[PDB]
Symmetry: D2
Subunit: 292 residues, 4 copies
């Protein structure tokens, strides 16, 4: 019988040595990519701040915290923000920012915590509920459908909806999977939230099981600038996958998390979406108010 | 022809979702094991405090920080401490403690940083050097010997040596491998630093390649106290490996890192050691005062 | 740092012991599946015999031999047959049949050899060429496209073309992928060559990379008739992948292998085919007579 | 959760493509190595034939058939030989020899079959039992001890013993693990059965679990002659593992398979073994006669 013997179990750590896959090529380019989410768009800052001001929002939950980018902006702008994420490699970066800016009182008062959408209700005390829960940049699509029925999608989305105060707002988005599913090409860098300073090439694979689109996998080949001989760049690659959320399924899923007690509007890039307009958006943003 | 597709590359993270090996069975008992073995022994506290004080040490580098237990003791007793480690999954727990106690002025002053013994000089500013460097808990032995000659142990020990000020101390220990390599059994829980609440069994595997002990592997079977049926214990395993440093070679390796310019003593468990003494230590502590 | 020890290298065998993946769960249902699907259809026998006879074929190369079912039919009906395949695990079953029937003079004359389509010219002496080459059973589609351009299909088809004598035939088929790629469902057991006793379900996954169907994967759930409790069926899965050859491209690929010097016809199931005919084949059989 | 998607299950085959790991570097050198077992020693041929002649042996079972080397020699010498092995990669070579030599009547009458030592009794009809069962060249040591107690060793050895006719012979061997266990070096090419024409370097690893030697792993680096630039050789590597059978354990195990109803003699290289002679043998051969 063939035995394989690992030096240590997958998932364990040890004091003087880097964790399991922390310095592979894939993790190295990936770090350049997550650091390139820096340069937020004027449009983005303008839309989101205006939405939240117009509604009088003050406590806000960022449920896809990441490196802290969206959250750092709300802290700076005076909101009282709680930020959670299920990933520790990403939470490390937010945490580091809060420690650096500790002495600025608004950053001493920023709550970053671990939480999973599947167990949110128990990970995060709702309190009287928040004024706006945000889940933006196609964070949500990372979540696969393991069970084949979309039960896990329904559960994460209900819990997210459970953190909205009555009268409050959920702002959640997804990339345009309707376009991607029909050209087979997720085109690089047409991005409405941060301007990318890296050049990347994307290969898109779409897996369809029986007749249903089940996953979109993107291979990102990143030109890394200083890494050849006489100043030339190198190229390296990493991969990430997603659930291809179509606008109509998603609209059903999201209004179902509210039990139908919501108003619901869907924007196109930051502008309205009239189904059958010419302009094919890169991202659909849904803004739901709990009306009940 | 065969090919193997993965969702995402090994090493990358994403906002929705737990990181790659994080909620495996082995990472859950392992998390038990680092938590319910971080309650220090009075002997150790008194030993380590009296030594540092005895030599008039005030700035200390902990170069194998882990969850911070060693540094926390020292941060509390009013030393200026900087703690590094290479493992993010472990530093996570020291960082979190610093935050929760960020209101006590000593804890506001604790530096915790990423660094690796191999590049330690490029990662930590010694300046004129620290008063003591500590690498306790049998952490040096985590570093494998990947090129068959011990060039990586040499490099690491030299970079650790360099952080010590002239007249400063290096305190670095290792398990008694001499014994382990004769009995083939690293016995559980005879621990001099921390008091273990958890019941465990250990299987020890020793790998020998063209007659040199090259690695010792411990498989931990942790009894987990409420996981079974009628309050009965539930059980899980994890594994971790060590380089088996024998006292005589390690003694040579560590002198050679100060270029011979050092005074060296080896403690028995905390007691002094002489060959063939009746008492068999579980740990050899080496104390090296740097002459120049 | 992590390392992974194996007992023995991947690909090596040893006298004591079963070969590496041989008694897995998947190799056991798979063995069921190749056995209890090798009982040929009267339609096929009559179709294939009449064609060969009709053109006065006598030496035949089976270039996708497998367990030998196609060759055995022909060896019995008095043709001079040489059978090659690249898979040892499959050739094993043809070899064994040859031995058991080594006393019948036709079977003493059957050649069964290892060869690969890619190197086929270097592996099989055509001499002046064979009368017919056969590659039936949807075997050509096993060859993946690993360089993204179909250079390996081209090479393989050209080397198969070269074994055909001038005035000889190439008979090569493929499943109807056109249909599969629109319905997303390769339906079970509508098979024209062999009569299946076994009950199976098939999940079909289609992989598409920057808008080109690149692979179809079938997961077979085989109902195994006595494996459960009270004679109840026990169940196991295995998986196998295909390159989805569409009729029009395959038609171009196969002409191009004879340099255009060929006459080409495509049969519907065994019946002739015309576009938009009401009858939808499960298999397209291509018959190519080489002109020069 | 990370999915990994294979093209096909481990262990399945498919008509136009090589089986899973058949053309890796490891399998390529390994084939040069198994083909280098060619050049049987004069000493070997002389001893074995003389033993078997002196006992009047005629039906003989080779239970570690391999490529067929020992068996081909007994066929040629007139014995009535049945040869079994559990490995198909190796049985393929024997089988091919029998087909080549088919017309020589003694090779038409050679029975090669698949069998496992663990299920031997049911794989091979004993008949009235054989005159000599042979298991030579350290075939037996390939068999690991999965259960930790040597139950599997006891079972394979009992079944092997069950194929010996009363008055018949078992000739079975093992390398000198007592020497290997004490120098840590299985030295290359001191071989008493075939002269090796390949130059190989061996690295020996010994794994000890708790105090018991559990496995000896050999990395064979083979100088392959024509594989560099101007005629120079290349070097490639494969690995194989074994149970370190000590002479005294083995002597117990083997006489226990007979229930103690045996005579037992143990040879040194082909010559007698007096425990405490100077000459340290490379191989111990045991010859047991069933006396009962
Ligand atoms: C790092 S996240 C933004 C995080 C955000 N600041 C937050 O609050 O969650 C970037 C997202 O943009 C995605 N995206 C969709 N199509 C893209 C494309 N063609 N190129 C780059 N990113 C694209 C990535 O898949 C990823 O999910
Ligand atoms: C929680 S860690 C100690 C961390 C410490 N703060 C530092 O300086 O890195 C527990 C340590 O005890 C070690 N240990 C070694 N042998 C052991 C044994 N037989 N029983 C229990 N713990 C053992 C483990 O290898 C591990 O490195
Ligand atoms: C036993 S093999 C045929 C071997 C044949 N003697 C030859 O020429 O290679 C069975 C073949 O039927 C194919 N097949 C394709 N689609 C199928 C389906 N839907 N149901 C059953 N078999 C299917 C399998 O892929 C496999 O290659
Ligand atoms: C191919 S087998 C011989 C097969 C034999 N003709 C039969 O009847 O089974 C070769 C054996 O010699 C072994 N052996 C032991 N020590 C060796 C060494 N230092 N170098 C080479 N082979 C050695 C291999 O491990 C292997 O098990």
């Amino acid at each position: 019988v063939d035995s394989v013997y690992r030096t240590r179990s997958l998932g364990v750590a040890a004091e003087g040595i880097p964790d399991q896959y922390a310095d592979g090529e894939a993790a190295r380019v990936w770090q350049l990519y997550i650091g390139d989410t820096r340069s937020r768009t004027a449009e983005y800052k303008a839309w989101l701040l205006g939405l939240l001001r117009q509604h009088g929002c003050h406590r806000v939950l960022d449920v896809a915290c990441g490196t802290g980018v969206d959250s750092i902006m709300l802290v700076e702008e005076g909101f009282s923000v709680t930020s959670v994420d299920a990933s520790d490699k990403m939470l490390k970066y937010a945490l580091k920012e809060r420690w650096n800016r500790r002495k600025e009182p608004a950053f001493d008062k920023w709550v970053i915590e671990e939480a999973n959408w599947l167990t949110l209700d128990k990970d995060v005390p709702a309190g009287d509920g928040f004024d706006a829960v945000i889940c933006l940049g196609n964070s949500f699509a990372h979540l696969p459908d393991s069970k084949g029925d979309q039960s896990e999608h329904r559960l994460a989305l209900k819990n997210i909806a459970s953190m909205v105060r009555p009268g409050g707002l959920l702002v959640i988005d997804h990339r345009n999977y309707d376009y991607i599913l029909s050209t087979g090409c997720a085109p690089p860098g047409k991005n409405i939230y941060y301007k990318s300073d890296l050049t990347k090439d994307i290969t898109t694979s779409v897996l369809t099981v029986n007749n249903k689109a089940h996953m979109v996998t993107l291979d990102y080949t990143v030109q890394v600038p200083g890494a050849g001989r006489d100043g030339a760049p190198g190229f390296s690659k990493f991969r990430l996958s997603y659930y291809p959320h179509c606008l109509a399924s998603f609209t059903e899923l999201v209004q179902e998390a509210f039990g139908g007690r919501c108003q619901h509007s869907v924007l196109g890039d930051f502008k309205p979406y009239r189904p059958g307009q010419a302009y094919v958006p890169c991202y659909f943003i849904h803004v739901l108010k709990k009306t009940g």
